[PDB]
Design a protein around this motif. Structure first.
Motif, PDB file in Angstrom:
ATOM      1  N   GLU A  97       5.724  10.615  13.781  1.00 42.59           N
ATOM      2  CA  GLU A  97       6.887   9.747  13.721  1.00 42.59           C
ATOM      3  C   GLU A  97       6.576   8.524  12.887  1.00 42.59           C
ATOM      4  O   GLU A  97       5.590   7.853  13.179  1.00 42.59           O
ATOM      5  N   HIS A  98       7.405   8.231  11.850  1.00 41.89           N
ATOM      6  CA  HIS A  98       7.216   7.079  10.982  1.00 41.89           C
ATOM      7  C   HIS A  98       7.548   5.841  11.772  1.00 41.89           C
ATOM      8  O   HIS A  98       8.706   5.640  12.155  1.00 41.89           O
ATOM      9  N   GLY A  99       6.553   4.971  11.878  1.00 43.57           N
ATOM     10  CA  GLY A  99       6.656   3.686  12.549  1.00 43.57           C
ATOM     11  C   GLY A  99       5.641   3.469  13.653  1.00 43.57           C
ATOM     12  O   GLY A  99       4.483   3.864  13.529  1.00 43.57           O
ATOM     13  N   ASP A 100       6.097   2.869  14.752  1.00 39.43           N
ATOM     14  CA  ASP A 100       5.321   2.529  15.939  1.00 39.43           C
ATOM     15  C   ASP A 100       4.553   3.694  16.593  1.00 39.43           C
ATOM     16  O   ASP A 100       3.464   3.476  17.113  1.00 39.43           O
ATOM     17  N   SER A 131      15.926   6.014   4.291  1.00 39.16           N
ATOM     18  CA  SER A 131      16.675   5.245   5.300  1.00 39.16           C
ATOM     19  C   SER A 131      16.140   5.463   6.718  1.00 39.16           C
ATOM     20  O   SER A 131      15.836   6.595   7.076  1.00 39.16           O
ATOM     21  N   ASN A 132      16.034   4.391   7.516  1.00 39.33           N
ATOM     22  CA  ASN A 132      15.487   4.470   8.880  1.00 39.33           C
ATOM     23  C   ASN A 132      16.535   4.695   9.995  1.00 39.33           C
ATOM     24  O   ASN A 132      17.648   4.185   9.877  1.00 39.33           O
ATOM     25  N   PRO A 133      16.192   5.410  11.108  1.00 35.80           N
ATOM     26  CA  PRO A 133      14.912   6.096  11.399  1.00 35.80           C
ATOM     27  C   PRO A 133      14.810   7.378  10.585  1.00 35.80           C
ATOM     28  O   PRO A 133      15.603   8.313  10.776  1.00 35.80           O
ATOM     29  N   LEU A 174       3.995   6.314   3.318  1.00 36.51           N
ATOM     30  CA  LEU A 174       3.734   4.862   3.294  1.00 36.51           C
ATOM     31  C   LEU A 174       2.686   4.408   4.348  1.00 36.51           C
ATOM     32  O   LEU A 174       1.788   3.625   4.013  1.00 36.51           O
ATOM     33  N   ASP A 175       2.789   4.919   5.591  1.00 36.48           N
ATOM     34  CA  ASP A 175       1.837   4.651   6.678  1.00 36.48           C
ATOM     35  C   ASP A 175       0.423   5.053   6.250  1.00 36.48           C
ATOM     36  O   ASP A 175      -0.503   4.265   6.421  1.00 36.48           O
ATOM     37  N   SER A 176       0.288   6.277   5.657  1.00 36.95           N
ATOM     38  CA  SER A 176      -0.973   6.810   5.139  1.00 36.95           C
ATOM     39  C   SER A 176      -1.479   5.950   3.981  1.00 36.95           C
ATOM     40  O   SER A 176      -2.653   5.604   3.966  1.00 36.95           O
ATOM     41  N   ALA A 177      -0.581   5.532   3.074  1.00 36.84           N
ATOM     42  CA  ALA A 177      -0.924   4.676   1.939  1.00 36.84           C
ATOM     43  C   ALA A 177      -1.494   3.330   2.395  1.00 36.84           C
ATOM     44  O   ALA A 177      -2.493   2.869   1.838  1.00 36.84           O
ATOM     45  N   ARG A 178      -0.884   2.728   3.425  1.00 35.09           N
ATOM     46  CA  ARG A 178      -1.333   1.459   4.022  1.00 35.09           C
ATOM     47  C   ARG A 178      -2.680   1.620   4.736  1.00 35.09           C
ATOM     48  O   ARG A 178      -3.533   0.729   4.658  1.00 35.09           O
ATOM     49  N   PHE A 179      -2.854   2.754   5.432  1.00 35.37           N
ATOM     50  CA  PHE A 179      -4.074   3.103   6.154  1.00 35.37           C
ATOM     51  C   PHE A 179      -5.257   3.200   5.199  1.00 35.37           C
ATOM     52  O   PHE A 179      -6.321   2.650   5.474  1.00 35.37           O
ATOM     53  N   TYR A 188      11.783  -8.328   4.180  1.00 37.17           N
ATOM     54  CA  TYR A 188      11.950  -6.884   3.914  1.00 37.17           C
ATOM     55  C   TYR A 188      10.680  -6.390   3.236  1.00 37.17           C
ATOM     56  O   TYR A 188       9.819  -7.200   2.881  1.00 37.17           O
ATOM     57  N   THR A 189      10.560  -5.068   3.062  1.00 43.08           N
ATOM     58  CA  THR A 189       9.457  -4.428   2.336  1.00 43.08           C
ATOM     59  C   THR A 189      10.130  -3.690   1.195  1.00 43.08           C
ATOM     60  O   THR A 189      11.217  -3.128   1.403  1.00 43.08           O
ATOM     61  N   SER A 190       9.511  -3.686   0.006  1.00 47.63           N
ATOM     62  CA  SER A 190      10.110  -3.000  -1.130  1.00 47.63           C
ATOM     63  C   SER A 190       9.123  -2.310  -2.081  1.00 47.63           C
ATOM     64  O   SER A 190       9.249  -1.111  -2.305  1.00 47.63           O
ATOM     65  N   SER A 209       0.996  -4.717  10.169  1.00 46.16           N
ATOM     66  CA  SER A 209       1.188  -5.255   8.823  1.00 46.16           C
ATOM     67  C   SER A 209       2.647  -5.042   8.419  1.00 46.16           C
ATOM     68  O   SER A 209       3.205  -5.882   7.708  1.00 46.16           O
ATOM     69  N   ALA A 210       3.255  -3.916   8.869  1.00 46.27           N
ATOM     70  CA  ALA A 210       4.656  -3.570   8.628  1.00 46.27           C
ATOM     71  C   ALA A 210       5.594  -4.665   9.195  1.00 46.27           C
ATOM     72  O   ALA A 210       6.533  -5.084   8.514  1.00 46.27           O
ATOM     73  N   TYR A 211       5.276  -5.182  10.399  1.00 42.32           N
ATOM     74  CA  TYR A 211       5.993  -6.293  11.015  1.00 42.32           C
ATOM     75  C   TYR A 211       5.667  -7.607  10.288  1.00 42.32           C
ATOM     76  O   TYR A 211       6.540  -8.472  10.165  1.00 42.32           O
ATOM     77  N   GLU A 212       4.423  -7.748   9.792  1.00 42.73           N
ATOM     78  CA  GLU A 212       3.957  -8.952   9.103  1.00 42.73           C
ATOM     79  C   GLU A 212       4.706  -9.235   7.782  1.00 42.73           C
ATOM     80  O   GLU A 212       5.066 -10.391   7.523  1.00 42.73           O
ATOM     81  N   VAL A 213       4.978  -8.172   6.985  1.00 42.84           N
ATOM     82  CA  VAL A 213       5.719  -8.256   5.718  1.00 42.84           C
ATOM     83  C   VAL A 213       7.175  -8.729   5.966  1.00 42.84           C
ATOM     84  O   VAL A 213       7.659  -9.593   5.236  1.00 42.84           O
ATOM     85  N   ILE A 214       7.842  -8.186   7.000  1.00 41.42           N
ATOM     86  CA  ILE A 214       9.208  -8.533   7.390  1.00 41.42           C
ATOM     87  C   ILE A 214       9.306  -9.986   7.781  1.00 41.42           C
ATOM     88  O   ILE A 214      10.162 -10.703   7.263  1.00 41.42           O
ATOM     89  N   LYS A 215       8.423 -10.439   8.656  1.00 35.92           N
ATOM     90  CA  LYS A 215       8.403 -11.832   9.063  1.00 35.92           C
ATOM     91  C   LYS A 215       8.200 -12.767   7.827  1.00 35.92           C
ATOM     92  O   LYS A 215       8.943 -13.742   7.689  1.00 35.92           O
TER      93      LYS A 215
END
Ligand SMILES: NC(=O)c1ccc[n+]([C@@H]2O[C@H](COP(=O)([O-])OP(=O)(O)OC[C@H]3O[C@@H](n4cnc5c(N)ncnc54)[C@H](O)[C@@H]3O)[C@@H](O)[C@H]2O)c1
Ligand SMILES: NC(=O)c1ccc[n+]([C@@H]2O[C@H](COP(=O)([O-])OP(=O)(O)OC[C@H]3O[C@@H](n4cnc5c(N)ncnc54)[C@H](O)[C@@H]3O)[C@@H](O)[C@H]2O)c1
Ligand SMILES: NC(=O)c1ccc[n+]([C@@H]2O[C@H](COP(=O)([O-])OP(=O)(O)OC[C@H]3O[C@@H](n4cnc5c(N)ncnc54)[C@H](O)[C@@H]3O)[C@@H](O)[C@H]2O)c1
Ligand SMILES: NC(=O)c1ccc[n+]([C@@H]2O[C@H](COP(=O)([O-])OP(=O)(O)OC[C@H]3O[C@@H](n4cnc5c(N)ncnc54)[C@H](O)[C@@H]3O)[C@@H](O)[C@H]2O)c1
Ligand SMILES: O=C1N[C@@](c2ccsc2)(c2cccc(Oc3ccc(F)cc3)n2)CC(O)=C1Sc1ccccc1Cl
Lengths: 328, 331, 327, 327
Positions: free
Chosen positions: D187-190, D132-134, D160-165, D242-244, D232-238
């Motif tokens: 920090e997870h995110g931005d 759950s975020n943050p 997840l950030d590392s996995a995407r990277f 959501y991301t799952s 890409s995290a913002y791209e999936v939401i748009k």
């Protein structure tokens, strides 16, 4: 009316992921069981010169069919059973005795390959060749020469096992799973293998940067002993149980997985390194390769220290000396 | 100032207690096939190996350990002393004399009873709450022996039994019909050996009774000679022994299958060696294969198979033969 | 040169070998995709949909999990060129049931969708096997077979594989046995007119009907007919609770895909043309146990049915043919 | 007697139980991934929306034939959660248009104020895995409310950030993400930190080969790979809302190490007080050794002055929010 006719109505009267294992000894059978348990093939073919042993091994595997997802297991002394294999694994031959060098097997297994390789190429001209028989580096060269295949479709198991053993020992020293311990053993699968101390890391943290004495004679922790242990590991296991089988079977299944599934993972495998590190000869030895549906598609150009590069050149010189002395 | 100290910051002291430990006793062809199968099915967080030949044991353990990168079992141990065996959930016994060419499994009874007298108390001492999985031949008699020596309740003493016989029967059935063994259903019960019983009535594909379709099924006047499929099951071990000297792969896979149901508490039905006293007119403490529900407490239940007069007679003959051997047992 | 050129030396400058396409990236399509991905059935996964944003988002989400998978290529596009040389094409596109709606009420609007999809799939993968999931699955398998011109062996409907899986789940729950060890078959229409074959119900080859002759009879004190009624109503129940069904069908499809991709020759209850059995003379598609391999349905199991069971199947068949001929 | 009694003769707690709290897109992706990886002998699901929860559980149960997890349970009451080895928290409030940062974080704290005591009551020896975020703040919140030692409180964090990277790195180089090594920490995110020094293929340092890696003076612009991770995290939401799938797979990977006591190294949120000049009870992603007791050890990454400053700024910002929170 036959029971089959009464039960089944037939609508209509070629394997897509066929794998062949040549040589059903301790190594061949460990490869076979590992591959079957990883669901890598829809067909498994087995070949050997000892017809009774071959039929017995095939039958033993077939009796376990209920627990596997490989619907067809075949065997035969004739290579027609190997037709249209995507991957052919060669494990046939003489094995090294207690205290015997893998390089002492060369003339015995060269003569074996002179017969095997043409038979495999005839029935599976588009396969990838995965050489396991010792000395693996020289015999990969031999298989490449006899087959006439492009260098991408001729792969030696090489240092994939040496690197796996190195990571096991590294993991044991650090209290971390080998999967998370990174380190590479390159060059000859044998006494002249090269530990790349510079590439050793956990979570991208360089061990050499943290401990500059790593792998040198200055080292109080004696990390050079980890690589000695790797070199000596086969000799130790041979002394204790008479041969090695499980670790190599698992290492082969890992290489087969990247080939069959076109993963494009990086493995240290025996490939032709002519043009690299000042090697001008047709020498095969382990360097990190990108493994996939076409075998070795690419090579990772490892940055080595002058000492590391010299050790690799010594390995290549030793291998070429043996290779020059071969008539086909 | 070690590299380990410079690289890793420790939060906790080593709190070693394996939650899914498996032990294999005897590191021969069978034991090692069992070990590799279990390792490749991710059934354990710890694997322990025991044998009397110390060099062979160390070599086998090391060979497995060298493959650690390719496995998901973080600890592999071995030793002649059973202290390496402590707190195993499942202990697999594969130690002992194996049949030579043309030798009956029943001829092995005195030899392996003699070794079980030593093994079973040592395993019970270090893993008192484990389930025992007997593989050593004659598996039915040795499951009885293990149950008697251990003092364990009958649910925690399981023999590999006819799980392999049934598996081979389905392979042959599948080959005859052109269907995967998974879709071919058939049960071989009783003695893991010469007096095993093919249950012709339960043979089916997609719930379609083969006996109903072909009433001659399993009889002598059968033009298709389906009785030969069971004959092939009985001889299978002899034929494999004759060809390669022993059997290993199929039994290791069959053991891993039984271990899967026990370790994962699946409650799948398997034909395994259990005490059948009170069934089919058997009044004695006979162990033989009947379909059992296998889970975290071993055999929790038994399937009461409806047998024909002929089928029940064959099973009773098997039970009588086994009790005769069990009766004379000195231990 | 580039970092890539400095790091990697290229040796080699090939057609997909185990390619699977999923058409429709809704709840069903995505459950099929994740199940297939986690079962290592394909070396290439292609996704097609008409909603371009959703399609790109779904593809990307799957691609971001690549580190945890062993399927090296995941592609998507509205254009069917991304689908080329697929061994298996899974159709999950279309209208789904609303609470209390019959699957047969989807026929005309999902037939129009297939009229566009099937020619595009056949153009890029002429040798593929078609696995139909879209409802009504039995009618739409017939539709896919008619439009494609493919031999009946390469046109498979998910059928009663899920109905049978649900039946075994319920049977297992009643008996305290794993569904894997509980055997039972639900045949015919994937829907309201499905047929429970009570005679085939068994555990360890022990006939439940023989032990309990009242099995699936109105008199039956244990009311085993209720297990089949629960199977019929299962989709309706799940739709009422979460709005749709996805996970169970994904798992069922991945199971069928496993038999096809690995040429297992396992027996599954799937929608196929049953013309020639049980006095059916029409081109009707419904679930019967089939041998599934690399050429799709190679064989059919001839189930021995009671006069009541055969009549029920014939009624199911008559209902389906009536709808089929009118399209 | 009953059919069951006639068929079965009777002779006679979950050992590897996993709980997922919140059955939204994240929770359900975690559930399916865990189920397909055979990590548990029992799966428990909890949510506040009772209909959705029952529907999700049923859909999973209908797939039991294709799984090796014999028991799937659900309920609003945490008694279904009892003796779980691992409890995964994916529950959370859906952010509103106006919403300030503190408003959104306090709403999630209010959700955790109810969840965490209920989980600890029924599974006092469990490991907590916060999604759950943050995620960084909520891992701290879960640690504070539970009273658990810091080793048993894990935040999915930067896995997840590392996995995407690694996915993007792999796409740039034509290598499987498994063979592409790179770490995204903090920090997870931005505000995540790409550790350029650790980036390698086959132990070959990318920074050593290309010294301008990740800096502004790079012609190849590798800094864009990390930008793309954040982007890409913002791209999936748009695109899909959501991301799952990716997070589901990432969580199942973390669960595998914990359940199987693998002692693999993952970038997960943990308490970093005492490191990089951080003096407050702040939770951030660093590489951790994950096993049967959760985080047993951590890898001490050598960071540049810039990398250390970024992490410190992140920690200062997180602590400022953490002191103004109502528990
Ligand atoms: N890391 C490695 O690369 C590695 C590791 C272990 C062993 N090995 C090598 O693998 C080879 C085999 O090992 P092993 O333990 O299985 O020996 P083995 O004695 O068990 O088996 C060898 C098999 O090859 C068969 N064979 C011999 N000539 C043949 C021919 N012309 N055609 C077909 N089959 C033939 C034999 O009949 C025998 O069954 C050896 O060369 C050994 O050194 C390599
Ligand atoms: N139930 C089945 O379906 C089945 C199938 C195949 C084999 N088997 C049986 O499994 C047994 C072993 O077969 P194998 O091929 O592995 O024989 P093997 O000779 O290769 O191995 C036997 C091992 O047991 C060890 N051993 C002997 N005494 C011991 C003791 N007191 N403690 C610990 N270890 C001891 C030996 O040292 C040896 O390593 C035999 O009894 C055989 O008949 C059963
Ligand atoms: N056991 C079964 O056979 C079974 C089980 C569950 C659902 N279903 C069926 O599966 C279908 C889909 O279910 P769902 O939950 O995924 O619905 P959904 O609405 O969530 O998804 C449907 C998808 O199909 C796409 N689509 C529509 N027309 C298309 C076209 N011409 N080309 C490509 N894509 C197109 C939509 O854009 C949408 O993404 C329904 O027909 C439903 O009834 C079958
Ligand atoms: N750490 C990561 O990398 C990562 C990635 C994606 C999403 N997330 C986060 O995961 C969370 C959930 O994502 P989502 O897409 O599943 O959202 P969602 O809204 O679809 O699901 C949330 C679920 O939590 C439930 N819930 C709310 N309060 C509850 C309570 N008191 N007890 C039990 N359940 C409760 C809701 O009813 C709902 O089903 C969000 O906070 C999201 O930001 C984290
Ligand atoms: O994939 C992710 N999706 C999430 C998201 C997306 C963009 S910012 C946050 C996500 C999920 C559901 C709703 C949702 O709503 C939003 C959208 C934008 C907001 F500013 C805040 C909340 N957001 C949650 C989340 O943490 C990640 S991972 C991630 C996020 C940012 C940079 C780098 C990474 Cl690896």
């Amino acid at each position: 009316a036959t029971l089959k006719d009464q039960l089944i109505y037939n609508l209509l009267k070629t394997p897509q992921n066929k794998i062949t294992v040549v040589g059903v000894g301790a190594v061949g059978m460990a490869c076979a069981i590992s591959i079957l348990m990883k669901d890598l093939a829809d067909e498994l073919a087995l070949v050997d010169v000892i017809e009774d042993k071959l039929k017995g091994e095939m039958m033993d595997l077939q009796h376990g069919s209920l627990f596997l997802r490989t619907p067809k297991i075949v065997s035969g002394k004739d290579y027609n059973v190997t037709a249209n294999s995507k991957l052919v694994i060669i494990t046939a031959g003489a094995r090294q005795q207690e205290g015997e060098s893998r390089l002492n097997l060369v003339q015995r297994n060269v003569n074996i390959f002179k017969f095997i390789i043409p038979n495999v190429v005839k029935y599976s001209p588009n396969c990838k060749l995965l050489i396991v028989s010792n000395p693996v580096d020289i015999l990969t060269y031999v298989a490449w020469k006899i087959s006439g295949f492009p260098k991408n479709r001729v792969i030696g198991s090489g240092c994939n096992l040496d690197s796996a053993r190195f990571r096991y020992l590294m993991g044991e020293r650090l209290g971390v799973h080998p999967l998370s311990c990174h380190g590479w053993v390159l060059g000859e699968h044998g006494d002249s293998s090269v530990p790349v101390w510079s590439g050793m890391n956990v979570a991208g943290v360089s061990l050499k940067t943290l401990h500059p004495d790593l792998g040198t004679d200055k080292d109080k922790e004696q990390w050079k002993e980890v690589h000695k242990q790797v070199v000596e590991s086969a000799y130790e296991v041979i002394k204790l149980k008479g041969y090695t089988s499980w670790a190599i079977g698992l290492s082969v299944a890992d290489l087969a997985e990247s080939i069959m599934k076109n993963l494009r993972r990086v493995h240290p495998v025996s490939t032709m390194i002519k043009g690299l590190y000042g090697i001008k000869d047709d020498v095969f030895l382990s360097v990190p390769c990108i493994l996939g549906q076409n075998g070795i598609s690419d090579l990772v150009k490892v940055t080595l220290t002058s000492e590391e590069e010299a050790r690799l050149k010594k390995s290549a010189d030793t291998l070429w000396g043996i290779q020059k002395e071969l008539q086909f």
